[PDB]
Amino acid sequence: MAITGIFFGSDTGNTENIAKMIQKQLGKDVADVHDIAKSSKEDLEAYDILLLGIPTWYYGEAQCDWDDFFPTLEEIDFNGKLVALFGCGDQEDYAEYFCDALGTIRDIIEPRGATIVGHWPTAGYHFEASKGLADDDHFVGLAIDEDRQPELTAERVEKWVKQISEELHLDEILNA
Numbered sequence: 001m002a003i004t005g006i007f008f009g010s011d012t013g014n015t016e017n018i019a020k021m022i023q024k025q026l027g028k029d030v031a032d033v034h035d036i037a038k039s040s041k042e043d044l045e046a047y048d049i050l051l052l053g054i055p056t057w058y059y060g061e062a063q064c065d066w067d068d069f070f071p072t073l074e075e076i077d078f079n080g081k082l083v084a085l086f087g088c089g090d091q092e093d094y095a096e097y098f099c100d101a102l103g104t105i106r107d108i109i110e111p112r113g114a115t116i117v118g119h120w121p122t123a124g125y126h127f128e129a130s131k132g133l134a135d136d137d138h139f140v141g142l143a144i145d146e147d148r149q150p151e152l153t154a155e156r157v158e159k160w161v162k163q164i165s166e167e168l169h170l171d172e173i174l175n176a
């Protein structure tokens with residue numbers, strides 16, 4: 001079976017394309033793609049590496065499928081699991097809520113013993129606040145935006161996948 005579980009929350013379906021652009025680089029032998037709706041606690045524990053994609057909506061809201069799973073997420077064993085986060089957003093009016101829901105996963109996985117990878121630079125975050133920040137210089141996960149919407153996506157998710165592949169040591173699996 002695959003060693004990486006990619007799980008993506010969605011509404012407009014944009015995150016499915018991100019999950020596929022991740023999986024195609026890693027290879028199907030290395031990564032598989034899921035939506036938390038079909039998951040149980042053991043469905044994550046089966047994997048060593050977990051890529052948890054989450055969009056943010058309606059002023060820092062998490063999508064209902066992930067929100068309903070959070071009381072199960074806090075029971076999952078993450079001890080020694082490698083975890084990376086990804087997301088997309090709009091912040092023109094949502095200026096304090098850009099990719100807010102990244103913080104919601106990041107808060108739960110660490111005390112359950114996760115090892116975090118896959119930071120992404122802000123390149124000088126411009127707006128009021130964002131809860132996905134690990135530092136003012138970098139988000140804790142991939143957070144794509146280009147003029148209030150996700151575009152110029154493929155080059156950014158290629159760079160992010162290549163970065164996690166050298167933290168996770170998937171690079172020496174996928175380039176073989």
Ligand SMILES: Cc1cc2nc3c(=O)[nH]c(=O)nc-3n(C[C@H](O)[C@H](O)[C@H](O)COP(=O)(O)O)c2cc1C
Pocket residue numbers: 009010011012013014015016055056057058059060061088089090091094097098099100149150
């Ligand atoms: C009414 C509305 C509210 C939104 N609220 C936020 C928000 O609080 N934070 C954010 O980062 N993005 C926000 N977004 C942007 C969406 O996350 C983004 O455009 C995209 O549609 C997400 O698609 P996906 O869930 O299918 O991946 C919002 C979009 C709309 C239309």
